[PDB]
Design a protein around this nucleic acid. Structure first.
Ligand SMILES: [Mg+2]
Ligand SMILES: [Mg+2]
Ligand SMILES: [Mg+2]
Ligand SMILES: [Mg+2]
Ligand SMILES: [Mg+2]
Ligand SMILES: [Mg+2]
Ligand SMILES: [Mg+2]
Ligand SMILES: [Mg+2]
Ligand SMILES: [Mg+2]
Ligand SMILES: [Mg+2]
Ligand SMILES: [Mg+2]
Ligand SMILES: [Mg+2]
Ligand SMILES: [Mg+2]
Ligand SMILES: [Mg+2]
Ligand SMILES: [Mg+2]
Ligand SMILES: [Mg+2]
Ligand SMILES: [Mg+2]
Ligand SMILES: [Mg+2]
Ligand SMILES: [Mg+2]
Ligand SMILES: [Mg+2]
Ligand SMILES: [Mg+2]
Ligand SMILES: [Mg+2]
Ligand SMILES: [Mg+2]
Ligand SMILES: [Mg+2]
Ligand SMILES: [Mg+2]
Ligand SMILES: [Mg+2]
Ligand SMILES: [Mg+2]
Ligand SMILES: [Mg+2]
Ligand SMILES: [Mg+2]
Ligand SMILES: [Mg+2]
Ligand SMILES: [Mg+2]
Ligand SMILES: [Mg+2]
Ligand SMILES: [Mg+2]
Ligand SMILES: [Mg+2]
Ligand SMILES: [Mg+2]
Ligand SMILES: [Mg+2]
Ligand SMILES: [Mg+2]
Ligand SMILES: [Mg+2]
Ligand SMILES: [Mg+2]
Ligand SMILES: [Mg+2]
Ligand SMILES: [Mg+2]
Ligand SMILES: [Mg+2]
Ligand SMILES: [Mg+2]
Ligand SMILES: [Mg+2]
Ligand SMILES: [Mg+2]
Ligand SMILES: [Mg+2]
Ligand SMILES: [Mg+2]
Ligand SMILES: [Mg+2]
Ligand SMILES: [Mg+2]
Ligand SMILES: [Mg+2]
Ligand SMILES: [Mg+2]
Ligand SMILES: [Mg+2]
Ligand SMILES: [Mg+2]
Ligand SMILES: [Mg+2]
Ligand SMILES: [Mg+2]
Ligand SMILES: [Mg+2]
Ligand SMILES: [Mg+2]
Ligand SMILES: [Mg+2]
Ligand SMILES: [Mg+2]
Ligand SMILES: [Mg+2]
Ligand SMILES: [Mg+2]
Ligand SMILES: [Mg+2]
Ligand SMILES: [Mg+2]
Ligand SMILES: [Mg+2]
Ligand SMILES: [Mg+2]
Ligand SMILES: [Mg+2]
Ligand SMILES: [Mg+2]
Ligand SMILES: [Mg+2]
Ligand SMILES: [Mg+2]
Ligand SMILES: [Mg+2]
Ligand SMILES: [Mg+2]
Ligand SMILES: [Mg+2]
Ligand SMILES: [Mg+2]
Ligand SMILES: [Mg+2]
Ligand SMILES: [Mg+2]
Ligand SMILES: [Mg+2]
Ligand SMILES: [Mg+2]
Ligand SMILES: [Mg+2]
Ligand SMILES: [Mg+2]
Ligand SMILES: [Mg+2]
Ligand SMILES: [Mg+2]
Ligand SMILES: [Mg+2]
Ligand SMILES: [Mg+2]
Ligand SMILES: [Mg+2]
Ligand SMILES: [Mg+2]
Ligand SMILES: [Mg+2]
Ligand SMILES: [Mg+2]
Ligand SMILES: [Mg+2]
Ligand SMILES: [Mg+2]
Ligand SMILES: [Mg+2]
Ligand SMILES: [Mg+2]
Ligand SMILES: [Mg+2]
Ligand SMILES: [Mg+2]
Ligand SMILES: [Mg+2]
Ligand SMILES: [Mg+2]
Ligand SMILES: [Mg+2]
Ligand SMILES: [Mg+2]
Ligand SMILES: [Mg+2]
Ligand SMILES: [Mg+2]
Ligand SMILES: [Mg+2]
Ligand SMILES: [Mg+2]
Ligand SMILES: [Mg+2]
Ligand SMILES: [Mg+2]
Ligand SMILES: [Mg+2]
Ligand SMILES: [Mg+2]
Ligand SMILES: [Mg+2]
Ligand SMILES: [Mg+2]
Ligand SMILES: [Mg+2]
Ligand SMILES: [Mg+2]
Ligand SMILES: [Mg+2]
Ligand SMILES: [Mg+2]
Ligand SMILES: [Mg+2]
Ligand SMILES: [Mg+2]
Ligand SMILES: [Mg+2]
Ligand SMILES: [Mg+2]
Ligand SMILES: [Mg+2]
Ligand SMILES: [Mg+2]
Ligand SMILES: [Mg+2]
Ligand SMILES: [Mg+2]
Ligand SMILES: [Mg+2]
Ligand SMILES: [Mg+2]
Ligand SMILES: [Mg+2]
Ligand SMILES: [Mg+2]
Ligand SMILES: [Mg+2]
Ligand SMILES: [Mg+2]
Ligand SMILES: [Mg+2]
Ligand SMILES: [Mg+2]
Ligand SMILES: [Mg+2]
Ligand SMILES: [Mg+2]
Ligand SMILES: [Mg+2]
Ligand SMILES: [Mg+2]
Ligand SMILES: [Mg+2]
Ligand SMILES: [Mg+2]
Ligand SMILES: [Mg+2]
Ligand SMILES: [Mg+2]
Ligand SMILES: [Mg+2]
Ligand SMILES: [Mg+2]
Ligand SMILES: [Mg+2]
Ligand SMILES: [Mg+2]
Ligand SMILES: [Mg+2]
Ligand SMILES: [Mg+2]
Ligand SMILES: [Mg+2]
Ligand SMILES: [Mg+2]
Ligand SMILES: [Mg+2]
Ligand SMILES: [Mg+2]
Ligand SMILES: [Mg+2]
Ligand SMILES: [Mg+2]
Ligand SMILES: [Mg+2]
Ligand SMILES: [Mg+2]
Ligand SMILES: [Mg+2]
Ligand SMILES: [Mg+2]
Ligand SMILES: [Mg+2]
Ligand SMILES: [Mg+2]
Ligand SMILES: [Mg+2]
Ligand SMILES: [Mg+2]
Ligand SMILES: [Mg+2]
Ligand SMILES: [Mg+2]
Ligand SMILES: [Mg+2]
Ligand SMILES: [Mg+2]
Ligand SMILES: [Mg+2]
Ligand SMILES: [Mg+2]
Ligand SMILES: [Mg+2]
Ligand SMILES: [Mg+2]
Ligand SMILES: [Mg+2]
Ligand SMILES: [Mg+2]
Ligand SMILES: [Mg+2]
Ligand SMILES: [Mg+2]
Ligand SMILES: [Mg+2]
Ligand SMILES: [Mg+2]
Ligand SMILES: [Mg+2]
Ligand SMILES: [Mg+2]
Ligand SMILES: [Mg+2]
Ligand SMILES: [Mg+2]
Ligand SMILES: [Mg+2]
Ligand SMILES: [Mg+2]
Ligand SMILES: [Mg+2]
Ligand SMILES: [Mg+2]
Ligand SMILES: [Mg+2]
Ligand SMILES: [Mg+2]
Ligand SMILES: [Mg+2]
Ligand SMILES: [Mg+2]
Ligand SMILES: [Mg+2]
Ligand SMILES: [Mg+2]
Ligand SMILES: [Mg+2]
Ligand SMILES: [Mg+2]
Ligand SMILES: [Mg+2]
Ligand SMILES: [Mg+2]
Ligand SMILES: [Mg+2]
Ligand SMILES: [Mg+2]
Ligand SMILES: [Mg+2]
Ligand SMILES: [Mg+2]
Ligand SMILES: [Mg+2]
Ligand SMILES: [Mg+2]
Ligand SMILES: [Mg+2]
Ligand SMILES: [Mg+2]
Lengths: 48, 275
RNA sequence: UGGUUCGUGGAGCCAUGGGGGAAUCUGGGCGGACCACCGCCUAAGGCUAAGUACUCCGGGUGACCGAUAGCGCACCAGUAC
RNA sequence: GAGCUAGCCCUGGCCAGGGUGAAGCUGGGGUGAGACCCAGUGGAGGCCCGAACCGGUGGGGGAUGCAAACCCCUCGGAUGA
RNA sequence: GAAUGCCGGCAUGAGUAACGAUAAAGAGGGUGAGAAUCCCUCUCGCCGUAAGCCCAAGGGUUCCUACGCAAUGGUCGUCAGCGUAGGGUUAGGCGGGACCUAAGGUGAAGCCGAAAGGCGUAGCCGAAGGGCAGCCGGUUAAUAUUCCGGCCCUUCCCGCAGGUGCGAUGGGGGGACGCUCUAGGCUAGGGGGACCGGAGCCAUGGACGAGCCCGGCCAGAAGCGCAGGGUGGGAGGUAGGCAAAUCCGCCUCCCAACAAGCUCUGCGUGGUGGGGAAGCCCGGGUGACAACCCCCCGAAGCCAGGGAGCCAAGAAAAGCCUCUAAGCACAACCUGCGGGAACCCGUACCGCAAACCGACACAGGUGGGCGGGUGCAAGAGCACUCAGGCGCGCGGGAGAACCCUCGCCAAGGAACUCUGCAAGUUGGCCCCGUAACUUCGGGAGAAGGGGUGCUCCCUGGGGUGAUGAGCCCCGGGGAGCCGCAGUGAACAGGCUCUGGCGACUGUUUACCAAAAACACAGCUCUCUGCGAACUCGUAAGAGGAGGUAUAGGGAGCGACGCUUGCCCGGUGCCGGAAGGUCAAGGGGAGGGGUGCAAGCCCCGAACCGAAGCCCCGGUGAACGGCGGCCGUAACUAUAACGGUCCUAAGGUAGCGAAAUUCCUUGUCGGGUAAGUUCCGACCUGCACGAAAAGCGUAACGACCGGAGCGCUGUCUCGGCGAGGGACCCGGUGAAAUUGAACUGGCCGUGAAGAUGCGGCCUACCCGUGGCAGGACGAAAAGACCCCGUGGAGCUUUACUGCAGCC
RNA sequence: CGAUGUCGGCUCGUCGCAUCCUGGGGCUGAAGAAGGUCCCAAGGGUUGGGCUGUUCGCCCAUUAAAGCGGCACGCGAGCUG
RNA sequence: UGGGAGAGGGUGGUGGAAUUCCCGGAGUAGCGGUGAAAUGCGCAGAUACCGGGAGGAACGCCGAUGGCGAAGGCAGCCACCUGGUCCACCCGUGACGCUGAGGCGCGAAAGCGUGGGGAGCAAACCGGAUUAGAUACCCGGGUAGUCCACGCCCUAAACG
RNA sequence: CCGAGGGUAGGGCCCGUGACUGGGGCGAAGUCGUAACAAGGUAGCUGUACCGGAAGGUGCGGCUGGAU
RNA sequence: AAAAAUG
RNA sequence: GCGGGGUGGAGCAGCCUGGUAGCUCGUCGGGCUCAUAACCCGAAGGUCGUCGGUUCAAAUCCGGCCCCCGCAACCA
């Protein structure tokens, strides 16, 4: 049947994207948390 | 002159539709229409403020002139009468001798191809619009400005009308379609006569379909929901309300007066609505 | 109403949202309701180093661990997944 | 977090074939004029039968399954909410 | 040493289940250390509205080539979507961007909010919508509408010539639209052809034939022709389209009006350029100087912005056109010609799947287009089949039980069973014929019958054409032939009678309930006069609504028919300038602290003081409620009547052992050989009852009862047969569970149900296929039950608060 | 209670004797036939339907008889639900 | 042809009297009602009297033993549309007539459907009296209806 | 070919019958009331409508077959 | 301008 | 199992707070009538379900028994 994940490259980059992050004080903190942790990718990647 | 249908389908038994007799023109005037933004009962927040609305047929809003003191003393010929999906009343196209064209709500008995004009000296004749103070007492009138130069706010529904019961000072006394007696300022313009399509209330829908076509989604009773959703909800089997019948927010819905007490308009209301 | 040990207590003092609203030293605040006496201090403008706090960073030292312990990671780790 | 699900808004797309034959219209009859009747044309419908498509009624199988909801027979709606 | 402990490792089950569709395989010839699994050929089977082909999303080198097989592939492996290395994605015209806008988002102005931030006209972003100029053929191992070949086309710049008041983000026009049906004329595509082109073929009884088989096109500028779309022309006046305006709008006059013309498409033709088979020979070559024509069927597609009808009344902006303003008319625009310029990103491959979403090379899920031929009434249905693509990545044997799925059956035909669950019966089309009842449509395909194939003869009409032939499409009558059976295979309702419920099509518990629940039109109450009421939000702001009492919110009932009685004492709501009660506050009789005192400070009565509450009334389609005991009639029995206590008032109509009836299988009747269910009645209704509506109702229902016919493996009552498993051999090889084991029966005992203790009996050691009584067998720290001063959701006249309102 | 699946039916049985039949008897108010009551006896047998979820029971039609009970109200790692 | 009468019918418009309610003034111990009372109303200011307003219904005197129509039925006034009927003159057509099974239409009041309207009156209902009881006659309240529009029902002591 | 007739299916009319139920008819002498004939003690009747243990009461309109 | 049944 | 009740012939107050049983109908006697009912005037009748206890005294307060109503009987 239809599962949960139906990938969409536009939706992904607009929802979890970097520019989406910077627009909310929470999303800013999201980046700040990940940079301090040291993750290699602050945002899900997508090719566009 | 509502039409019926033979009952060839069980929903078509009772269905009735308007005769569309008075309608002369099948398509509106392109210059006077603009897109109607369908809200779906949802505000700017995105939350539903009015439940169970949306999904109706698409509509183009037709601009209406509710301020005929705009073009004083400039006559106009009734070009045509068209169907407006945005209100109960039919509307009439006006071809001003000025060349400008406008829609006004179509009063009953207005015949295509007749002069209409606005101004304190306009003849008392169906379709002409005057300030209230210059209109003979007792005449039928509609499209009443509630306050001066703010646009017609009263008696715009199909078949409605307002009567004049007397004057007092600058104000004149109207009998509104609700029966209320309201002092309205004399300088408030108003269009003489009664609103057309007075057979609107006898339209029997026929089936749930026409509730959706008009954009009215299904309305689900309270006692059918659950405690978390509504006061009447819950209860084993069917059950009465067991409490004063109350809205989904708790305020009682059986004869509870809600109008704000200290409202300044109270000074200008003579008699509460009838019946 | 808040702060102080002070939870309305005899409840001051400091601070203040509302109302009313002075004085320039013979002016004014405080010493726990309030009064008198006796004292202290001069509100409604501002700046001020040092003493104190922390450890991403560098070093030194351990009756600290020794690859299931010690940071999650001694190794290409916030990686694989 | 509304890329699953629920509701709405914007913009597009889809529904083989067949059956029934409302109103209206034209002709004729009818009457003082009408209502009305008859045949033709007409092609209405949350109409009918039935694929796609959308469903998931009954039964069986499957039960460490092909599958954390599937498969077979059967069955409902299918120009409309 | 234990914590259903944590990490890791290795066992047990077990060489057992399984190897992921039952569409299917065999042989031969290569290669290779090795082959059922790789490659080639012939034979066979499977899809063919796909299991074929092309796009879009998603995926990200999986495409091609070479060399490789440890691991990945449910076996094997030389093979591959795996490993290594090399190569591969070419655009002014396809798509997107340098154009436009919709939701929505963002947001100079402005508004709001303790901070963070929330709104918001314009503007801007935003596409699978609008706008926009390329078609055919070839070529690479792999790219192509991208390279190449031919024939076309757009924009930008400069130059020139011709024409004109040129000029815009400002005005106007246009762009510009729904649903159902639909004309005419084309095209795609399809069928036949004794006509044309063709390598061959003569089989096994016949056929040298008007034979067999193959093929008989594609694109194409100007011009031409057929078919359609669109648009009237001039003059005058003008106060409107937020300046101007010749434009647009409005008025008046004149000529024209199914036209014509002018303009735009579509198709046909068109210089020319390509393509072009079967077969045979080793992807290529011939076939070939290939031919390339006629008739018919014909679209949902094109002309298109066509036409008619209808109610629910059917996007915006730009490109394009016109109008004029500053400006400027040495210019600028338009047309034509010439030369010059034309950028970024995507192009591989998979793409109903082994490459996407499902942990897997997963029987599931995934939007758009093409989707051929014949026959069956038609069709995207069913069967077979072209092009094309596959036999689903373990096999080989055996022919037990048992399971799955499928086929058949004597006589009986629901005796099965909770129930005809299931499986039978019926089945498509034509024609005759068809009941109660009904809201006149219906019920109705009701029911119930008959026909159905092929051949010869005769004969009506339609389309094309021409009016005819040809081809095609509908029928009619007669005469006959074969079979058990003629929709000869596949797809394709069993029917009837009577109840309860709900009016109806519809909706839901994704993932055990599709219902009698929800919704629905329709009825009633009730709120709201506009900056509405209500809702969301602290607000600003929104929705309501660019709506205005024929409108909008809330509540209950739920088509329609006939109806909806009595009670306002209590609660709710509505009304009520009296009175009572009432906080802050005003007031300050009168007392207190202290100072020598002027004074300072505190307590503080009567009275004045809103809502609310008390109080007076109203109100049922507001919450709710609608009795007991006793006597009495010329047989008895029962009470039309009466007596009495009480209540605010005591249940009317209609219904009633019901979805409700305890006693209950109440009693009588029907149906049956027999009826705790079903139907009709009766009424002493434990405990129906009138908008949590009362009683009914034609039609509708995968709803739930009862009955009958038809037919059946449901059953008496089982039997045979087929295939996939189960079994055997080769390859690969899990699982939960598991204290350890050398694990028998009985009679007792034991924490009260023993392989383990006592006595007695029986019993050689170890397995394979089977059966499920035991190991209180596995699985889940019982979900019922209580326990915890454990938790959570919900209710109100429980307590105390807060929003909101007064 | 870190689980002992709970009615009934189907299938498959096995045991007990307080025997329903058949067999052997005593007594009888046993003439015969046919019964009544007790005694011995468990080898075999103990039907088919209607209604109800039923167990039980009633009813139809038969029968030599249409027995009562145990085995976790036998039996769900056998099924139905 | 020329004239007369009439509540004959249909539409529109219009006048005053009164009742009820609302507002204003003024006023105080009761009003209302019956055979007599009581329910009801009234100091929360009624009745009675004045002024103003809203709204519906019906048309006093004329008026009659009167008139009109086929019947049921029709009554303020103004206008418009229109039927029936009588007198006069003796002009015209020249038996063209009378009744009328079916058929069609009209048809008081009550009743019904959909909307409208709603002062007064008033079935059903509530209450007060009478009574053995009073589901009545009488008093206090009161909904359908009575009224307008359209569409049904078509009955009668529709009787002279 | 026609055809008595037999079989199946669906309809039409008539008669008999049925738990129960509806009123109706009569039946020397039951119960409860008194509506009508006198102005029947509320004039009577009537069409209709609502209600009531029952006759009947009331509402709208009509007749006199109503007395004074 | 009519209080009040029956045999 | 819990709750309420039993008193003239019928239906009910008195019971809560001990001392005195009352209301309507009915029954009887007598009036009006031709006669009945209606109506008027008088009158009669209850040892309080039963038994036991408390108390100076029990319809009355406390126990037991009988009967008549009424409510509950749930999770399985
Ligand atoms: Mg789907
Ligand atoms: Mg996942
Ligand atoms: Mg999706
Ligand atoms: Mg996308
Ligand atoms: Mg977002
Ligand atoms: Mg890095
Ligand atoms: Mg109209
Ligand atoms: Mg927004
Ligand atoms: Mg948002
Ligand atoms: Mg709407
Ligand atoms: Mg919620
Ligand atoms: Mg709640
Ligand atoms: Mg409730
Ligand atoms: Mg409920
Ligand atoms: Mg209930
Ligand atoms: Mg409120
Ligand atoms: Mg105002
Ligand atoms: Mg504090
Ligand atoms: Mg000092
Ligand atoms: Mg001082
Ligand atoms: Mg101090
Ligand atoms: Mg300072
Ligand atoms: Mg400092
Ligand atoms: Mg160490
Ligand atoms: Mg060391
Ligand atoms: Mg080590
Ligand atoms: Mg470590
Ligand atoms: Mg570190
Ligand atoms: Mg590193
Ligand atoms: Mg590091
Ligand atoms: Mg979504
Ligand atoms: Mg057809
Ligand atoms: Mg048909
Ligand atoms: Mg037509
Ligand atoms: Mg047709
Ligand atoms: Mg349909
Ligand atoms: Mg059909
Ligand atoms: Mg169907
Ligand atoms: Mg399709
Ligand atoms: Mg669903
Ligand atoms: Mg299923
Ligand atoms: Mg199943
Ligand atoms: Mg499952
Ligand atoms: Mg189907
Ligand atoms: Mg739709
Ligand atoms: Mg092993
Ligand atoms: Mg094993
Ligand atoms: Mg095995
Ligand atoms: Mg196996
Ligand atoms: Mg199969
Ligand atoms: Mg081989
Ligand atoms: Mg494929
Ligand atoms: Mg490959
Ligand atoms: Mg290779
Ligand atoms: Mg390998
Ligand atoms: Mg391998
Ligand atoms: Mg090019
Ligand atoms: Mg852009
Ligand atoms: Mg833009
Ligand atoms: Mg700003
Ligand atoms: Mg914003
Ligand atoms: Mg586009
Ligand atoms: Mg393009
Ligand atoms: Mg090509
Ligand atoms: Mg390729
Ligand atoms: Mg090229
Ligand atoms: Mg110009
Ligand atoms: Mg056509
Ligand atoms: Mg064809
Ligand atoms: Mg040749
Ligand atoms: Mg031969
Ligand atoms: Mg012109
Ligand atoms: Mg102008
Ligand atoms: Mg201008
Ligand atoms: Mg061509
Ligand atoms: Mg051409
Ligand atoms: Mg050659
Ligand atoms: Mg088109
Ligand atoms: Mg147009
Ligand atoms: Mg069109
Ligand atoms: Mg045209
Ligand atoms: Mg339509
Ligand atoms: Mg339109
Ligand atoms: Mg723009
Ligand atoms: Mg200038
Ligand atoms: Mg490509
Ligand atoms: Mg597809
Ligand atoms: Mg593939
Ligand atoms: Mg996959
Ligand atoms: Mg596979
Ligand atoms: Mg798959
Ligand atoms: Mg699909
Ligand atoms: Mg197709
Ligand atoms: Mg096709
Ligand atoms: Mg086909
Ligand atoms: Mg055939
Ligand atoms: Mg067919
Ligand atoms: Mg198929
Ligand atoms: Mg058989
Ligand atoms: Mg047979
Ligand atoms: Mg049979
Ligand atoms: Mg049967
Ligand atoms: Mg049985
Ligand atoms: Mg069942
Ligand atoms: Mg079945
Ligand atoms: Mg019948
Ligand atoms: Mg029919
Ligand atoms: Mg039927
Ligand atoms: Mg048939
Ligand atoms: Mg044949
Ligand atoms: Mg043709
Ligand atoms: Mg021909
Ligand atoms: Mg033969
Ligand atoms: Mg079939
Ligand atoms: Mg069928
Ligand atoms: Mg039948
Ligand atoms: Mg339903
Ligand atoms: Mg349905
Ligand atoms: Mg479910
Ligand atoms: Mg679930
Ligand atoms: Mg289901
Ligand atoms: Mg708020
Ligand atoms: Mg707003
Ligand atoms: Mg409303
Ligand atoms: Mg309901
Ligand atoms: Mg109902
Ligand atoms: Mg009621
Ligand atoms: Mg009340
Ligand atoms: Mg009250
Ligand atoms: Mg004070
Ligand atoms: Mg004070
Ligand atoms: Mg107060
Ligand atoms: Mg109550
Ligand atoms: Mg007796
Ligand atoms: Mg009633
Ligand atoms: Mg009653
Ligand atoms: Mg029964
Ligand atoms: Mg019987
Ligand atoms: Mg049953
Ligand atoms: Mg029954
Ligand atoms: Mg009984
Ligand atoms: Mg009920
Ligand atoms: Mg109710
Ligand atoms: Mg019913
Ligand atoms: Mg009916
Ligand atoms: Mg029914
Ligand atoms: Mg049934
Ligand atoms: Mg049944
Ligand atoms: Mg069988
Ligand atoms: Mg086999
Ligand atoms: Mg052993
Ligand atoms: Mg034992
Ligand atoms: Mg031992
Ligand atoms: Mg076992
Ligand atoms: Mg087994
Ligand atoms: Mg536990
Ligand atoms: Mg549970
Ligand atoms: Mg255990
Ligand atoms: Mg267990
Ligand atoms: Mg014995
Ligand atoms: Mg023995
Ligand atoms: Mg014996
Ligand atoms: Mg004897
Ligand atoms: Mg004998
Ligand atoms: Mg035996
Ligand atoms: Mg035995
Ligand atoms: Mg039976
Ligand atoms: Mg029983
Ligand atoms: Mg015997
Ligand atoms: Mg037991
Ligand atoms: Mg039992
Ligand atoms: Mg058992
Ligand atoms: Mg089980
Ligand atoms: Mg077991
Ligand atoms: Mg069950
Ligand atoms: Mg089941
Ligand atoms: Mg007369
Ligand atoms: Mg003559
Ligand atoms: Mg006549
Ligand atoms: Mg009437
Ligand atoms: Mg009416
Ligand atoms: Mg009255
Ligand atoms: Mg009438
Ligand atoms: Mg015959
Ligand atoms: Mg015959
Ligand atoms: Mg009488
Ligand atoms: Mg009455
Ligand atoms: Mg008597
Ligand atoms: Mg007594
Ligand atoms: Mg007492
Ligand atoms: Mg006494
Ligand atoms: Mg006496
Ligand atoms: Mg005593
Ligand atoms: Mg005493
Ligand atoms: Mg419970």
């Amino acid at each position: 049947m239809k599962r949960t994940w139906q990938p969409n490259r536009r939706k992904r980059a607009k929802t979890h994207g970097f520019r989406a992050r910077m627009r909310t004080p929470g999303g800013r903190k999201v980046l700040k948390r990940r940079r301090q942790k040291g993750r290699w990718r602050l945002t899900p990647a997508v090719r566009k | 002159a509502v039409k019926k249908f033979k009952p060839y389908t069980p929903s078509r038994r009772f269905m009735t539709v308007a005769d569309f007799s008075e309608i002369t023109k099948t398509e509106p005037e392109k210059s006077l229409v603009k897109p109607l933004k369908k809200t779906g009962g949802r505000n700017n927040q995105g939350r539903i403020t009015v439940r169970f609305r949306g999904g109706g047929h698409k509509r183009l809003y037709r601009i209406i002139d509710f301020k005929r003191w705009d073009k004083v003393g400039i006559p106009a010929k009734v070009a045509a009468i068209e169907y407006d999906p945005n209100r109960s009343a039919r509307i009439a196209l006006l071809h001003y001798v000025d060349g400008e064209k406008r829609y006004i709500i179509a009063p009953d008995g207005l015949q295509v191809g007749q002069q209409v004009v606005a101004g304190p000296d306009a003849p008392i004749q169906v379709g002409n619009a005057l300030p209230l103070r210059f209109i003979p007492v007792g005449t039928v009138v509609h499209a009443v400005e509630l306050e001066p130069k703010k646009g017609a706010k009263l008696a715009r529904a199909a078949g409605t009308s307002a009567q004049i019961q007397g004057r007092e000072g600058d104000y004149v006394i109207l009998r509104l379609p609700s029966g209320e007696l309201r002092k309205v300022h004399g300088e408030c313009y108003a269009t003489v006569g009664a609103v057309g399509n007075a057979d609107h209330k006898n339209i029997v829908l026929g089936k749930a379909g026409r509730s959706r076509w008009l954009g009215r989604r299904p309305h689900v009773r309270g006692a059918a929901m659950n405690p978390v959703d509504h006061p009447h909800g819950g209860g084993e089997g069917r059950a009465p309300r067991g409490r004063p019948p109350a809205s989904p927010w708790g305020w009682q819905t059986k004869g509870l007066k809600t109008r704000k007490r200290r409202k300044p308009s109270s000074r200008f209301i003579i008699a509460r609505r009838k019946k």
